[PDB]
């Protein structure tokens, strides 16, 4: 035997760096090294522990707190990979994803990926280098292990092809976490907010009733996918810690049981070492090696996305909101709102030179299919333009939406021969999130402008544009009469109107045959 | 119900009575539990279904 000290049956097995993290679940099959039937014995905690001789034993009774966030999914996966062992620049433990993430959450996009992970460390233990062990190897390793024509895709199936030389041993807390932010009152650190929240759960801080603090918290719980995994420790106690009736009781029972349910939970910069470095010959070392890249190819493969998390519907009903009849402006306009339902909001209105009854185009509408928080409604309404000084008893203004933080308007709205400057009046209009808008380049196509009216202030309405927009349906004021608007005036705009980009927005049809290639949505 | 009118009720009997509980019969040591400490509802069970012991 190899002794009764909790960890020892984890060290110098094979270990799938594409499973789970630090957890024995992902140790292989067979043990490589014959660790010899000399035994230690050491004290820890009043207990006596065996354990070989040829490893050590460093007891360190302390918590380590860890976070991996990231608003990118592969950003994520590469924090997770760091600082085990393992050389190059390598996504590893691809099979954690989704035991700490449903599968539609990795997909989607505009979700925070966060593990805030609590290991609680009674001790490590750790191996001999690799030269060292080269005369420890069991028999049948070796022989695959050095033998020229044993494939390094059979080696590495067979004995994984990295194992297990350093670990931490005691218990693991994963409190992972997909957050919708944009619907987040996003003003604190996601990170922090986690950490304060997994905290407050196990009962390392009370939070007080109506703070900041719970407010936050409240806010990440309520809108996040939460789970709570255990890699060593009492089985069965993530429930009761996660949701069940007394958390912070369930959690130090399982903290308190951990010297009886220790188990590998955490890996240090030393704890992965490859198979590669075991063998006798340096020609031998250098195939193995030079084979990683292909055994890794599969896992290495890219999350599948939902960037198209706008549901366009480009073609709504059409109602007249105004004609600036009276205003005595030179040229007609008339605008238009899109009729909203279902979730579906307006951006802008539709503008014409003319006084028809009839829209002469469409201004499209977008759902938030996702629940994502991309639409979110104006904080308020500005003036680009009213008609003080024309002397017309009706009034004839041009308003911009004020976007929340982070948010932009895609269109003005004009309020045309009204009783007092009454702002809009629009439940459905939203603004849409930085992340699927681009700032306005061009302003082209000008609809119209007030000239004529002999009101102080002036303002032309203009087609805003972008690479990569959807050609726009909508407006924005100009305070002034210049023909083309110049870059102080397409600079006025940035970080409050933009356009939505193309690669955010797609029709039910396009929707429906991107979402039919994601799995499980 | 949180924000219930019994809520405020209760609320209001417990923090402006003084208040014990007395077992009499049953598994002993289970009164503190349900009445102040972790988990009263399953201190509470283990008693129930305790009583024939």
Not at 31 to 41: N, R, V
Not at 96 to 114: A, H, K, M
Not at 236 to 257: K, N
Request: glycine share 8%.
């Amino acid at each position: 035997q190899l002794g009764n000290l909790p960890g020892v049956t984890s060290m110098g097995m094979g270990y799938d760096v594409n499973g789970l993290y630090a957890s024995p679940e992902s140790l292989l099959g067979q043990p490589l090294f014959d660790f010899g039937g000399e035994l230690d014995s050491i004290e820890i905690e009043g207990r006596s522990y065996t354990f070989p001789r040829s490893m050590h034993v460093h007891t360190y009774f302390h918590s380590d707190f860890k976070q991996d966030v990231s608003k990118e999914i592969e950003e994520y996966r590469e924090k997770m990979s760091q600082h085990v062992g393992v050389s190059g620049r390598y996504k590893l433990f691809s099979a954690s994803l989704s035991v700490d993430f449903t599968t539609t959450d990795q997909q989607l996009t505009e979700i925070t990926y966060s593990s805030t992970r609590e290991a609680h460390v009674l001790w490590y233990i750790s191996l001999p280098g690799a030269a060292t062990l080269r005369s420890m190897l069991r028999r049948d390793f070796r022989d695959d292990l050095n033998n020229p024509n044993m494939p390094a895709m059979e080696l590495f199936k067979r004995y994984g092809p990295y194992y297990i030389s350093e670990a931490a041993v005691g218990g693991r807390l994963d409190y992972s976490a997909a957050s919708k932010t944009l619907k987040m009152d996003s003003s604190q650190s996601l990170s922090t907010t986690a950490e304060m929240s997994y905290k407050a759960l196990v009962g390392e801080i009370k939070i007080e009733h109506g703070s900041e603090m719970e407010k936050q918290v409240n806010s990440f719980r309520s809108n996040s996918t939460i789970r709570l995994t255990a890699t060593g420790g009492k089985p069965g106690m993530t429930d009761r810690i996660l949701h069940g009736p007394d958390s912070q009781q369930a959690f130090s029972q399982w903290a308190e049981s951990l010297l009886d349910y220790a188990t590998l939970m955490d890996f240090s910069t030393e704890s992965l070492q490859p198979i590669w470095a075991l063998a006798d010959k340096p020609e031998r070392r250098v195939e193995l090696e030079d084979a990683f890249p292909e055994f890794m190819k599969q896992s290495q493969q890219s999350i599948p996305k939902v960037d198209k998390v706008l549901l366009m519907d480009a073609r709504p009903p059409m109602v007249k909101a105004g004609e600036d009849s009276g205003s005595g402006a030179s040229e007609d306009l008339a605008v238009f709102n899109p009729s909203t339902s279902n979730g579906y909001k307006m951006v802008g209105q539709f503008g014409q030179r003319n006084h028809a009854s009839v829209a002469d185009g469409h201004a499209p509408i977008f759902k938030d299919l996702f629940d994502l928080g991309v639409l979110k409604a104006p904080v308020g309404w500005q003036r680009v333009w009213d008609d003080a000084g024309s002397g017309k008893s009706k009034d004839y203004a041009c308003w911009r939406a004020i976007p929340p933080q982070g948010y932009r308007a895609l269109g003005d709205v004009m309020m045309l021969a009204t009783s007092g400057y009454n702002p809009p009046n629009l439940p459905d209009y939203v603004c849409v999130h930085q992340s699927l808008c681009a700032d306005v380049q061009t302003l082209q196509n000008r609809v119209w402008w007030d000239k004529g009216t002999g009101a102080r202030k002036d303002v032309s309405l203009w087609q805003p544009g972008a690479a990569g927009a959807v050609a726009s349906s909508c407006f924005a004021g100009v305070p002034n009469y210049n023909n083309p608007p110049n870059s102080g005036d397409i600079e006025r705009l940035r970080g409050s109107i933009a356009c939505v980009k193309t690669s955010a927005i797609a029709s039910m049809q396009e929707m429906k045959s991107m979402l039919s290639q994601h799995q499980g949505m």
